[PDB]
Amino acid sequence: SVSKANVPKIDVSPLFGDDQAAKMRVAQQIDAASRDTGFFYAVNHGINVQRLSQKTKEFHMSITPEEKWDLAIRAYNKEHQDQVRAGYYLSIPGKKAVESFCYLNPNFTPDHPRIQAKTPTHEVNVWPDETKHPGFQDFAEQYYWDVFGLSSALLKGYALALGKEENFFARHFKPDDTLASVVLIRYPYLDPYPEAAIKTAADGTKLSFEWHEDVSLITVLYQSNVQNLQVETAAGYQDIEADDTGYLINCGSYMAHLTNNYYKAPIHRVKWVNAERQSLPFFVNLGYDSVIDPFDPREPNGKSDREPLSYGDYLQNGLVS
Numbered sequence: 001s002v003s004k005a006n007v008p009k010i011d012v013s014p015l016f017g018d019d020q021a022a023k024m025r026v027a028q029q030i031d032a033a034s035r036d037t038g039f040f041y042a043v044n045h046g047i048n049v050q051r052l053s054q055k056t057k058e059f060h061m062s063i064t065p066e067e068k069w070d071l072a073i074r075a076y077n078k079e080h081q082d083q084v085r086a087g088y089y090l091s092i093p094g095k096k097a098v099e100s101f102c103y104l105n106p107n108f109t110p111d112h113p114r115i116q117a118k119t120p121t122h123e124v125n126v127w128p129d130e131t132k133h134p135g136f137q138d139f140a141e142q143y144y145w146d147v148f149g150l151s152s153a154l155l156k157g158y159a160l161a162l163g164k165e166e167n168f169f170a171r172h173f174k175p176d177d178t179l180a181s182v183v184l185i186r187y188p189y190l191d192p193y194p195e196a197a198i199k200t201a202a203d204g205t206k207l208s209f210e211w212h213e214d215v216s217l218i219t220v221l222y223q224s225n226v227q228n229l230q231v232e233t234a235a236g237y238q239d240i241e242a243d244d245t246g247y248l249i250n251c252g253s254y255m256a257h258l259t260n261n262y263y264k265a266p267i268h269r270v271k272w273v274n275a276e277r278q279s280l281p282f283f284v285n286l287g288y289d290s291v292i293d294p295f296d297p298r299e300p301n302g303k304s305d306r307e308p309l310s311y312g313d314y315l316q317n318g319l320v321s
């Protein structure tokens with residue numbers, strides 16, 4: 001069988017406070033995890049994840065085919081040419097099992113300057129009818145800000161881990177312009193399960209999704225308590241244990257770029273499991289114009305031979321790829 005990946009549980013609660021040495025001890029743990037498998041569980045994070053799971057389940061289980069077309073991104077509904085990112089991503093019964101709903105910064109309203117300019121990667125969220133889904137929009141928007149807050153705290157820990165001041169990343173992660181997204185992914189139980197929705201890896205493993213690096217600075221993920229994720233290490237792919245009380249954290253490829261691969265974006269994949277479950281990532285993205293100068297923490301002078309890349313260029317390029 002597959003070895004279990006080392007995915008430590010880190011109490012991140014000091015990152016919300018003013019005990020600087022305690023924050024450094026958290027930063028060390030983040031450093032160690034980042035340099036090992038690239039994953040850790042954030043615990044004592046303050047978010048009500050059971051309620052998140054319950055509200056998300058109520059939504060997934062009550063939304064109708066009519067509503068899904070009405071909310072569909074343009075890959076599924078040609079009428080919705082402005083919806084590249086935000087909206088409903090339909091299942092295809094007999095073929096594609098997964099379905100999801102993505103939303104972006106609630107501050108991307110029609111009057112937002114980037115929406116007015118039609119800047120790539122910015123969209124105004126779409127929502128189901130309030131009467132059919134009472135409280136869902138308000139809950140989902142509040143969740144965005146709850147997970148934004150956790151993510152800001154985690155970015156302080158990453159900054160300290162890399163030898164920087166604690167606002168090194170967080171100063172570019174702002175409510176008025178963050179390109180961060182929430183995705184509410186449903187993985188269904190199906191009997192029989194469509195073979196066309198099952199991929200097989202080179203090593204024989206049945207997959208729902210093949211290997212990838214995340215398009216993000218960091219990813220902040222809640223999942224149901226059903227083991228499914230694997231990470232590629234030198235020892236081969238290893239199983240990441242489930243923990244539905246914590247947030248699974250890893251770096252995306254923007255972090256790898258900025259740190260000259262000192263904090264790699266780990267390659268990971270999703271095993272096929274025939275189980276009704278949830279995968280609720282928050283992709284921590286900066287602003288469209290955010291640029292952090294690449295560096296290299298392994299080098300005495302900290303200098304890197306990588307070219308600066310704006311977050312908006314990174315994201316546009318990554319989402320297409």
Ligand SMILES: N[C@@H](CCCC(=O)N[C@@H]1C(=O)N2[C@@H]1S[C@H](CO)[C@@H]2C(=O)O)C(=O)O
Binds near residue numbers: 086180209281319
């Ligand atoms: N629409 C988003 C970007 C979504 C990126 C994405 O689709 N991620 C993969 C996916 O689906 N999975 C990975 S992350 C996560 C596991 O690696 C999830 C899963 O399948 O569980 C946006 O515009 O910002």
Ligand SMILES: [Fe+2]
Binds near residue numbers: 212213214
């Ligand atoms: Fe991923």
